[PDB]
RNA sequence: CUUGAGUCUCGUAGAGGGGGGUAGAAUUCCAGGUGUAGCGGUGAAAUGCGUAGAGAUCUGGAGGAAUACCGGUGGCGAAGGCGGCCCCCUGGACGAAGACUGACGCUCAGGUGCGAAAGCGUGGGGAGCAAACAGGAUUAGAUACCCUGGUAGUCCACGCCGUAAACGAUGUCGACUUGGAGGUUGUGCCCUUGAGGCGUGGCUUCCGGAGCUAACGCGUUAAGUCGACCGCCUGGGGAGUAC
RNA sequence: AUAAUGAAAU
């Protein structure tokens, strides 16, 4: 998983304060960081099926949180996806 | 049942402690069961690990006829 | 940086080179911003079973802290050196400074 | 011949036969005997009595070497483990050691299949 | 099992010591059980059956001492 | 809005998964010494191996498959499954005291992944034993059960196949309803008598009360009392067969 | 150790 320093840095960058650990932006950013990191691991170990379930769970959780944010506030959603570089 | 490690509050079993490890093997070199000595399961697992490490490093034998 | 415990064994008829070996390995670890927490030389000991028709090996123990690459290089050195007949490297959770049971009853 | 005075006896005790071999302290054979060659065949070959007789014959066959002290090594599960030692003692040797050297693997090769009769 | 005959020690006592040491080591059981291959299904079934039999016998013998035969 | 659902800080136990090294016991084979008539196998036998020196005993070397004891009605995983020791990468569970978001949830036709043994394709490797096959026997016969040999396969890399009494023959989620004895893994306070008492969480084995069931039995881990969604059945053969 | 069979009804 991520390290303490990296987690603290992301929380400071994306949260309203160094104690806002449970905002949607912070959650999405943390999931994105870990998903990006694991691409290197799975390009070398292609037959590690047991670890891949966790990755897929992360992907699903991020999708659901983004749908909720898009429903509740469009402007914040646009800004967040622009900042994180998410689209197909 | 009486377990000396639980009596003395130990943290790890220390594969370097041959004098202690000697009480828990038979004369053929085999590991004694827990139901004979009265150890707890946690410390039994730790003890087996330590004995295997010592066997590799040659501080203890494997069998009685090498 | 992580914490490691290392043990290695040397041929009995090469016991005169152990101080030089210790010095060189210590220098290799210290040059990479690491530290040395425990060092011990146990002398010649009788083996429990023969290894390559030998008994009477020379034992050295160390507890150190360093990066991974230094430890990998040290392992390669052990592999290609012929005075060393066996070695072991293990990871620990914290630095260990106390004295070993072999320096309390030998 | 050449005197020795210190020897080893090897006992091979299987479910079907018993073999006794006497040797010096370096592995060089001096004489041997078996239950199947002592006048027993079939259902009488795997008895303690046959092992007894075989041990007596083996002791007789090595009398020109003048042996006094014997070590004993036993290998196998069959009937013949103890009668042979008793006969060797009765012949007139002095027994110094007894050891069991049956081979036991630490999970190696696959054994044969079970018999359905 | 390694036995050294002690001074003044007769032969029968040494023989009995050898037998006791062999039984404690348990070499005959190992040899007998390694003669033929056994399937994992059979191994697991035998283990469970032994445990169940022991438990049931314990309960029966402990609860049978609450009655009078005559 | 904070009670469902999540994020953050400190720890704990584990045969959970992918990659690379290494150790000790045992089987087989090759090359030598000592020694001399048997060995091996069965209910009883002989096919086989042996004076061209076997079987037994001792010394040196090669190779590749599995990890005794510990080890248990023990542990981990969605299921299939996972067991020597060391290092690198990596997934999930649980506990104590606090802070944060604010219904962000449950089920899921079609779709997409994973999926024991045997089997198929291309390239490697091959101790042990083993479909097919060959020869002793037994029998009225014996294309079998028993004995002596023995190759495909069993092992490794990559790609196919999609089935099992794949079983607790019991779909997933939430709430409520008398007791007893154990296993395993966390954590609080202390009469103080420092080796012992009194509490509070997760997982798990057995017995049994009311209720339920055709009976056998299930019984807070329900087959009891209720709510939300999904899959399936409608006499036996013909048939999970034909097109 | 091995070692087969018994029309339909009352």
From Swiss-Prot, chain B:
UniProtKB keywords: Acetylation, Ribonucleoprotein, Ribosomal protein, RNA-binding, rRNA-binding
Biological process annotations from GO: cytoplasmic translation; translation
A GO CC term attached to the entry: cytosolic small ribosomal subunit
Gene Ontology MF annotations: mRNA 5'-UTR binding; small ribosomal subunit rRNA binding; structural constituent of ribosome
Record flagged with keyword Ribosomal protein: yes
Keyword Ribonucleoprotein in record: yes
PANTHER family: 30S RIBOSOMAL PROTEIN S18 (PTHR13479), SMALL RIBOSOMAL SUBUNIT PROTEIN BS18M (PTHR13479:SF40)
Similarity annotation: Belongs to the bacterial ribosomal protein bS18 family.
Complexes and interactors: Part of the 30S ribosomal subunit. Forms a tight heterodimer with protein bS6.
Purpose of the protein: Binds as a heterodimer with protein bS6 to the central domain of the 16S rRNA, where it helps stabilize the platform of the 30S subunit.
Listed name of the protein: Small ribosomal subunit protein bS18
Higher taxonomy: Bacteria, Pseudomonadati, Pseudomonadota, Gammaproteobacteria, Enterobacterales
Swiss-Prot record, chain C:
Molecular function per GO: mRNA 5'-UTR binding; small ribosomal subunit rRNA binding; structural constituent of ribosome
Function, as annotated: Binds together with bS18 to 16S ribosomal RNA.
Residues of the full protein shown: 1 to 106 of 135
Organism: Escherichia coli (strain K12)
Disulfide bonds: none
A GO cellular component annotation in the UniProt record: cytosol
GO biological process: cytoplasmic translation
Subunit structure: Part of the 30S ribosomal subunit. Interacts weakly with uL2 in one of the 3.5 A resolved structures.
Protein name from the UniProt record: Small ribosomal subunit protein bS6
UniProt similarity note: Belongs to the bacterial ribosomal protein bS6 family.
N6-acetyllysine PTM sites in chain numbering: 93
Record key words, sorted: Acetylation, Ribonucleoprotein, Ribosomal protein, RNA-binding, rRNA-binding
Post-translational modification: 5 different forms of the protein, varying only in the number of C-terminal glutamate residues, were isolated. The sequence shown is form bS6-6, which is the longest. The first two Glu are encoded by the rpsF gene, the other Glu are added post-translationally by the RimK enzyme.
Source organism superkingdom: Bacteria
Swiss-Prot record, chain D:
Gene3D superfamilies given in the database record: Ribosomal protein S11
Pfam families: Ribosomal_S11 (PF00411)
Transmembrane keyword on record: no
Gene Ontology cellular component list: cytoplasm; cytosol; cytosolic small ribosomal subunit
One GO-annotated biological process of the protein: cytoplasmic translation
Keywords, in A-Z order: Methylation, Ribonucleoprotein, Ribosomal protein, RNA-binding, rRNA-binding
MF terms (GO), sorted A to Z: small ribosomal subunit rRNA binding; structural constituent of ribosome
Additional comment: Has been predicted to contact the N-terminal domain of IF-3 based on footprint studies; exactly how IF-3 interacts with the 30S subunit is controversial.
Family, per entry: Belongs to the universal ribosomal protein uS11 family.
Function: Located on the platform of the 30S subunit, it bridges several disparate RNA helices of the 16S rRNA. Forms part of the Shine-Dalgarno cleft in the 70S ribosome.
Quaternary organization: Part of the 30S ribosomal subunit. Interacts with proteins uS7 and bS18. Cross-links to IF-3. In stalled ribosomes contacts ribosome rescue factor SmrB.
Record-given protein name: Small ribosomal subunit protein uS11
Organism placement in taxonomy: Bacteria, Pseudomonadati, Pseudomonadota, Gammaproteobacteria, Enterobacterales
Gene (name only): rpsK
From Swiss-Prot, chain E:
Keyword Amino-acid biosynthesis part of the UniProt annotation: no
Bias kind Basic and acidic residues: ranges: 59-70
InterPro entries noted in UniProt: Ribosomal_bS21, Ribosomal_bS21_CS, Ribosomal_bS21_sf
Keyword flag Protein biosynthesis: no
PROSITE patterns: RIBOSOMAL_S21
GO biological process, alphabetically ordered: cytoplasmic translation; ribosomal small subunit assembly
Region (Disordered): 42-70
Compositionally biased tracts (Basic residues): 45-58
One cellular component term from this protein's GO annotations in UniProt: cytosol
GO molecular function list: rRNA binding; structural constituent of ribosome
Keywords, ordered alphabetically: Ribonucleoprotein, Ribosomal protein, RNA-binding, rRNA-binding
Family listed: Belongs to the bacterial ribosomal protein bS21 family.
Assembly description: Part of the 30S ribosomal subunit. In stalled ribosomes contacts ribosome rescue factor SmrB.
Function statement: Probbly involved in recognition of ribosome rescue factor SmrB in stalled/collided disomes; fusion of protein fragments to its N-terminus decreases ribosome rescue in the presence of SmrB.
UniProt xrefs under HAMAP family: Ribosomal_bS21
Name of the protein described by the UniProt record: Small ribosomal subunit protein bS21
């Amino acid at each position: 998983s991520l390290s303490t320093e990296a987690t603290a840095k992301i929380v400071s960058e994306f949260g309203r304060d160094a104690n806002d650990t449970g905002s949607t932006e912070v959650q999405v950013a943390l999931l994105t960081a870990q998903i990006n990191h694991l691409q290197g691991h799975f390009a070398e170990h292609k037959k590690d099926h047991h670890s891949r379930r966790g990755l897929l769970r992360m992907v699903s959780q991020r999708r659901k949180l983004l749908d909720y944010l898009k429903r509740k506030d469009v402007a914040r959603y646009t800004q967040l996806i622009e900042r994180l570089g998410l689209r197909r | 049942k009486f377990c000396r490690f639980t009596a003395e509050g130990v943290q790890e079993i220390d594969y370097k402690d041959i004098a202690t490890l000697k009480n828990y093997i038979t004369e053929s070199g085999k590991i004694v069961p827990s139901r004979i000595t009265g150890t707890r399961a946690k410390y039994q697992r730790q003890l087996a690990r330590a004995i295997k490490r010592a066997r590799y490093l040659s501080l203890l034998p494997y069998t009685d006829r090498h | 940086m992580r914490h490691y415990e290392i043990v290695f064994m040397v041929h009995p008829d090469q016991s005169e080179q152990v101080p030089g070996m210790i010095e060189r390995y210590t220098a290799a670890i210290t040059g990479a911003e690491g530290k040395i927490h425990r060092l011990e030389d146990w002398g010649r000991r009788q083996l429990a079973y023969p290894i390559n028709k030998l008994h009477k090996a020379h034992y050295v123990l160390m507890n150190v802290e360093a990066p991974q690459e230094v430890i990998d290089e040290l392992e390669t050195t052990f592999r290609f050196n012929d005075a060393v007949i066996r070695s072991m490297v293990m990871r620990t959770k914290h630095a260990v400074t106390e004295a070993s049971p072999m320096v309390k009853a030998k | 011949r050449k005197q020795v005075s210190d020897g080893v006896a090897h006992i091979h005790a299987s479910f079907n036969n018993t073999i006794v071999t006497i040797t010096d302290r370096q592995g060089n054979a001096l004489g041997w005997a078996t239950a199947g060659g002592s006048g027993f065949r079939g259902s009488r070959k795997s008895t303690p009595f046959a092992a007894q007789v075989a041990a007596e014959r083996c002791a007789d066959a090595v009398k020109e070497y003048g042996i006094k002290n014997l070590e004993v090594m036993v290998k196998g599960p069959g009937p013949g483990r103890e009668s042979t030692i008793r006969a060797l003692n009765a012949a007139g040797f002095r027994i110094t050691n007894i050891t069991d050297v049956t081979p036991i693997p630490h999970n190696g090769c696959r054994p044969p299949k079970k018999r359905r009769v | 099992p390694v036995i050294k005959v002690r001074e003044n020690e007769p032969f029968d006592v040494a023989l009995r010591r050898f037998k006791r040491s062999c039984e404690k080591a348990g070499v005959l059981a190992e040899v007998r059980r390694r003669e033929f291959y056994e399937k994992p299904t059979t191994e697991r079934k035998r283990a469970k059956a032994s445990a169940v039999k022991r438990h049931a016998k314990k309960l029966a013998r402990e609860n049978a001492r609450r009655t009078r035969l005559y």
